[PDB]
Every structure is written in structure tokens, then in C-alpha cells.
């Protein structure tokens with residue numbers, strides 16, 4: 057059977073639930089010794105075995121599981137496995153406790169119900185409705201062929217700008233269209249309601265952002281760490297102003313908004329990856345957050361695109377790239393605010409959170425670097441170099 | 454016994470208002486500033502309702518006549534600054550001194566006083582209550598704002614009427630050894646092309662021009678900002694489409710062929726102006742280009758604040774986007790490079806064409822930096838750069854077909870590098 061039959065839960069133990077897909081394929085919810093639950097495709101199913109294909113077949117042909125549908129495999133990394141070059145099956149590797157799961161089902165459903173179309177077409181949905189909290193197990197959306205994520209087309213656009221193949225207005229147009237897309241996304245997501253942030257909510261932000269700042273200061277080495285340590289008192293002072301921001305509107309957000317989540321194909325843009333920030337606990341990715349968190353996530357990512365272009369491109373002229381960094385963030389912010397005005401949704405964006413959340417986003421770049429990609433410390437170092445002394449001169453005036 | 458100024462002016466020959474052409478008589482004296490000792494400044498209206506600023510001097514030969522260089526009327530105006538009808542406003546600025554000695558100069562009637570000051574009589578005036586030259590408003594705002602990159606203003610004589618005071622006379626410092634930008638900027642690029650200057654040395658004036666423009670706009674913005682209405686940006690597109698139509702239907706040769714093919718793409722850029730409603734409008738230079746900048750010994754001075762001549766006389770005082778001056782200067786910097794390549798034998802075009810692109814970046818960077826340093830980023834809307842830049846190059850076509858036909862090469866080469 058499947059119950060009796062360690063690293064199985066990790067891509068490349070007791071059983072809680074099993075959805076037999078037939079022919080040896082199954083979607084299992086495995087609990088670890090540390091009370092950690094996992095969604096393990098069983099055949100572990102690798103891209104090509106057919107488990108992702110059997111999931112689409114089981115969803116297209118219809119009590120502990122829920123297989124919803126809406127009307128060969130090649131994987132690429134949660135784990136996203138393309139099926140038939142037409143649908144993307146995304147598994148949920150890590151599962152919460154027996155509590156809230158991935159909010160991607162509620163995010164996509166609210167966007168589709170609000171008229172938001174700048175996203176891949178949803179196909180199916182697999183949900184574990186057995187415990188006290190229904191946990192999302194798999195999502196199936198339409199596969200956009202020949203599509204590239206932001207870390208590919210935005211880098212290519214800025215590289216063409218540095219080579220003179222594009223004008224500044226041509227290079228800034230994607231940043232402006234991303235601003236209008238983000239406003240339509242927030243306007244559709246805010247339809248589910250708004251929640252004023254309590255004094256305990258803004259206090260939890262300060263302690264969390266100060267804790268991460270202390271971790272980065274104590275982990276970033278060499279000259280980059282010395283510059284960050286000198287900046288840390290200034291950053292900590294900005295974190296203290298969060299206590300006076302209680303009552304700011306909290307809505308359903310993307311949670312992990314950056315250019316890599318924006319796919320471009322045939323001149324059209326689509327948003328993906330509504331599973332929440334992976335660095336956040338599983339019981340917080342579905343919580344309502346400020347819309348400015350997505351705004352600072354995208355504007356910081358646009359800044360980082362320019363840093364990457366200068367870093368990786370031989371013989372690059374950094375002058376138009378660095379000018380693009382400032383102009384792309386303005387083009388994004390201007391189009392985002394004006395689109396919220398045309399949608400009568402100006403109330404969900406609180407620009408007082410720009411500087412504190414932007415600083416916290418760059419600190420996470422330090423933490424991501426020391427944990428996954430050590431040389432990446434140059435990106436938040438260059439971003440804060442152009443951002444911190446400018447914002448400090450205004451506070452001292 | 455002695456007749457008043459009104460009686461003398463009415464009995465004077467209509468040519469009194471002229472420094473050949475004929476004015477209809479008789480004349481009528483609307484306002485008179487008594488400068489003492491037989492000198493005066495009159496606001497005279499002819500039989501065709503045309504108003505004039507006339508420097509007047511009483512003369513025992515003909516009763517009254519128009520002041521000439523040497524009569525002492527410009528001296529008396531300057532002396533009146535170094536120190537009162539209700540219709541006149543005399544504002545003096547730091548540096549005015551009662552210098553003596555007059556000499557005529559052509560630069561709308563200018564008189565050199567003391568060989569260190571320039572008195573300029575505004576010969577032709579607008580109608581009563583109608584807008585005119587905003588030069589007095591511009592110069593006074595720059596002086597009160599601490600702007601010094603201009604000829605030191607000594608004083609302004611204005612007529613207290615209308616929404617803005619009507620300029621009657623201006624007194625500024627005389628700069629006998631100063632060239633305009635079409636001399637020194639062309640000379641800088643030529644020296645760059647033949648290796649006498651480095652690229653960094655040839656780009657420094659472009660950055661200094663950006664700082665000057667930002668200081669100028671920040672001072673001019675101190676009088677206030679006006680948000681552009683939807684009808685304003687709609688009228689901009691109408692005026693720019695008409696100028697584009699006039700250019701396409703007039704420019705000949707291969708330049709006209711390229712402009713005709715570019716016209717649909719240019720009109721598409723003009724269509725995005727409707728989304729720019731609310732952009733800030735301030736007092737601007739209005740006719741801003743390198744020819745308006747004097748340079749000597751590392752010092753820069755902007756002149757000519759009466760507005761755009763091709764614009765209607767009652768519209769040159771209206772508030773305009775600060776980006777219009779920016780576009781005017783960046784375009785003129787482009788044209789400086791085009792002129793160097795066109796006129797210099799055996800010139801190396803590569804360093805000049807690199808300077809064209811780099812000078813515009815140096816100008817914008819210094820302009821943005823100085824605006825931020827003065828906390829005046831709000832007045833510059835860079836979304837207007839491309840549509841207004843295309844409109845400036847189209848105006849070069851119109852200036853060419855009307856005054857200098859071969860000049861069509863300048864906007865042709867500029868648009869060739871600006872279009873994608």
C-alpha cells in the first residue's frame with residue numbers, strides 16, 4: 057500500500073492522507089517527525105514520471121481531497137512542472153501545521169472575480185479539506201510559451217538601453233505598465249475588504265525589522281558589513297516611526313512582489329507566484345499586509361535589475377543604467393498612483409511606509425546573500441548608497 | 454506760463470515716439486514720470502491706439518523732443534534709481550550708481566551710461582491692460598531670489614497696470630567683453646574636436662548650464678506654480694500639430710521626405726500630452742538657448758527675458774512648463790554640435806557627436822541635482838521632454854524655410870538620433 061511504503065519529502069515518516077492517481081501515481085500528505093507536513097508527489101515524482109500529468113487528468117475527469125477544475129511534462133524550479141507545454145502544475149513542498157496554507161487560491165479567485173486578467177489562466181486546484189484548516193496542495197494554471205520572467209526581460213531591456221538600441225522612454229514603458237498592472241491587482245484584491253493595522257501589528261513590524269537588521273549587521277562581512285553597520289543607526293531610526301503609523305490599511309497582497317514574478321510574452325504581462333513570501337512563516341503568508349509592501353518590493357527589484365546589469369555586462373556604460381534605476385521607480389510610482397486614482401482606490405496606498413519598508417527590503421537582500429548567494433551583498437550595498445544619504449538629508453531638514 | 458507735458462506732446466510731431474516708418478497723429482500723453490531738469494519718461498499713445506515709451510527732454514528750440522544719447526535722460530533715470538507718480542513703479546537693486554556719460558548702442562533702444570550700465574527703453578508697448586513683455590517680472594524675481602548668473606540689474610521702470618507691470622525701461626550692468634553661446638560653445642566643441650580640450654573639459658559648460666537653469670527656475674518658481682488644465686494641454690497639441698503640418702508642407706528636398714515619414718510618429722508622441730494634465734506651470738525664460746548665455750572668465754549670464762518671439766505678444770507672459778526651457782537648451786546644445794561638424798573643415802565628427810549625447814546628459818544631471826539641492830524637484834516634469842523636444846526641432850524647420858533655408862539639416866540630423 058502507501059502508508060507503510062527520510063529525504064523523500066525533499067525534492068532531489070508517517071502518512072496522513074493519500075490521493076491515489078492510479079498506475080502507481082499518488083499525491084501524498086506526509087508528516088515528518090518534527091510535525092512538518094509535506095506534499096510529496098509519489099510515483100518522489102520527478103519531472104517526466106507522469107504524476108503531474110496524472111494530476112491534470114484526475115482534475116479533468118473529476119472526501120479528504122478536493123479536485124477543482126475550470127474550463128509529456130517538463131519541470132522547472134515549491135516545484136513547478138509544465139504539463140504538455142500548456143499547463144503549469146505547481147506543488148506545495150512545505151505545508152503548515154494542523155495552520156493557514158498557501159493563499160494563492162484566494163488571491164487568484166479574487167483577481168478573476170474582479171476582472172483582473174493580467175495573469176495566466178487558471179486550470180485546476182487541489183486542496184486538502186480534511187483538517188481544521190484547508191491547505192492548498194497544488195495549483196494548475198495555463199503555461200505561457202516563450203514567456204520570460206522579469207529577471208530576463210527587464211535585464212535585457214536595460215542592456216539594450218545601455219547599448220543604445222532603446223530610448224529611455226522605451227525602457228521606462230515596461231516600468232510604467234507594471235505600475236498600472238499593480239494598481240489593478242491591488243484594486244481587485246482590496247475588494248475582499250480592508251483591515252486597519254492595530255498598534256500591536258505595527259509594533260510586531262518594528263521588532264521583526266529591527267531583528268533582521270541586527271542579523272544582517274552581525275553576518276555581512278568585510279567592507280560591506282562596515283558600511284552597513286554605520287548605516288544601521290540611521291535605518292533603526294526610520295524603523296522607530298512605524299509606531300505612529302497604526303491604522304494603515306491592510307489588504308490581500310501579492311506578498312512576494314518582484315520582477316521575477318512578472319512574465320512577459322508577446323508584449324503582454326502576467327503576474328505569477330501568489331504563494332506568499334517564503335521567508336515568512338506558513339501561518340503568516342495569508343495574512344493581510346500593506347499594499348506598499350508590494351510597491352516597495354517591485355521598486356527595489358527594479359533598482360536591483362540595474363545593479364545586475366552593471367555587475368554582469370562587460371563594457372557596460374553604467375550612466376544610462378543608473379539613470380534608468382531612478383526613472384523606472386518614478387515611472388512605476390507615477391503610473392501606480394494615477395491608476396489608483398482612476399480606480400478610486402487611493403486609500404489603500406500609504407506612502408509613509410515607502411522608506412521604512414524599502415530599507416527592510418534591502419536588509420533582506422543582505423540576509424538572502426549570506427544564506428544563499430554570498431556575493432549578492434553588492435546589490436543592497438549599492439542601493440542603500442544612493443538611497444540612505446538622500447533620505448537622511450530630508451529628515452535633517 | 455510754461456505749458457505742461459501733455460500740451461507739448463499733443464503739439465509734437467508723431468515721429469516723437471520713434472528713435473523709416475510713419476506714425477499717425479496727433480499724440481496723446483497717458484502718463485509722465487518727471488525725472489527733473491527737463492527730463493521725463495512719457496507713455497505716449499498715437500492716433501492708431503499704439504502706446505510708446507518715449508524718453509522726453511524739453512528743448513528751447515522746439516519745446517519738446519525725444520531724448521538722444523547725450524541729452525542726459527538715461528543718466529537721470531539711473532540717478533533716480535540711486536536714491537513719484539502713482540502710475541509708475543521705480544525699483545532699484547543693489548549696485549545701481551549715478552554714473553554719467555551716454556553712448557548709443559544697438560542690442561529696443563539701448564543707451565550705455567557710464568560705460569558700465571545699459572539703459573533699454575521699451576519703445577513699443579502693449580495696449581492698456583493687455584499683457585506685454587514679462588522681462589521686468591522675470592528679472593525682479595531672479596534678483597529677489599538670489600540669482601546672480603545674469604547681468605547685475607540696477608533698476609526697473611514699470612507702469613502700474615494690468616495683471617503684470619508693463620516694462621518701460623530696464624537698467625543692467627554692461628558687459629563689453631562677453632560672447633554669447635553660439636560663439637563660446639561652438640569654440641569649445643571645435644577645440645574638443647582637434648584635441649585642444651578633453652571631453653571632461655568640454656562637458657563642464659553643459660553641466661554649468663544645467664545648474665544655472667535650475668537656479669533660475671527655482672527663483673522663478675518662488676512666485677508660484679499653476680497646475681496645467683485639460684484645456685491647456687489640449688491647446689498645446691493643437692499648436693504643435695499645426696506647426697508640424699506647416700513644416701511637412703514646406704520643407705523641401707530629402708529633409709522634407711524624411712520629415713513626412715516621421716510626421717505620423719511625431720504626432721503619436723504629441724497625443725500623449727492629454728495625460729499630462731496637472732503638470733506644473735511657472736514663470737520661465739521662454740526663449741532659452743545657448744545664444745542667451747554670455748560667458749567670460751568662467752562666469753555665466755543669461756539675458757533676453759521678453760519671451761518667445763514667434764508666440765503672440767499677449768501670451769509670452771503666461772506660465773509654461775519648466776521642461777520647455779530644459780528642452781530649448783538641450784536642443785540648442787545638440788545644434789551646437791551639428792553646426793561644428795557642418796562648418797568646420799577637416800573636423801572629426803566622432804568626438805563632436807559623442808559630445809552631443811554627453812552634453813545633454815551632463816545638463817540634465819546637473820539640472821536635476823541642483824533642483825534637488827534647492828528642494829525644487831516638483832517644477833520639472835520630465836514626461837514632457839520627448840514631446841516638447843520634437844516640437845522644438847519642428848520649429849527649426851519653420852525657422853529654416855522662413856529665414857535660412859539650408860538650416861533644415863540641423864533638425865534633420867537631430868531627429869535622426871532622437872527617433873528609435
Ligand SMILES: Nc1ncnc2c1ncn2[C@@H]1O[C@H](COP(=O)(O)OP(=O)(O)O)[C@@H](O)[C@H]1O
Nearest residue numbers: 134144176197198199200203204205319328329
Ligand atoms: N503559467 C506560466 N507560464 C509560463 N511560465 C511560468 C508560469 N508560471 C510561472 N512561470 C515561470 O516559472 C518561474 C517560477 O515560478 P514561480 O511560481 O514564481 O515559482 P516560485 O514561486 O517557487 O518562485 C517564473 O520565473 C516564471 O517565469
Ligand SMILES: N[C@@H]1[C@@H](O)[C@H](O)[C@@H](CO)O[C@H]1O
Nearest residue numbers: 312313314316360420421424
Ligand atoms: N529578495 C528576494 C531574493 O531572493 C532575490 O532578489 C529574488 C530571487 O530569489 O527574490 C526576492 O524575493
Ligand SMILES: [Cl-]
Nearest residue numbers: 364367368432
Ligand atoms: Cl549577480
Ligand SMILES: [Cl-]
Nearest residue numbers: 792795796860
Ligand atoms: Cl549653418
Ligand SMILES: [Mg+2]
Nearest residue numbers: 316317328329
Ligand atoms: Mg516566484
Ligand SMILES: [Mg+2]
Nearest residue numbers: 312329331332
Ligand atoms: Mg514563490
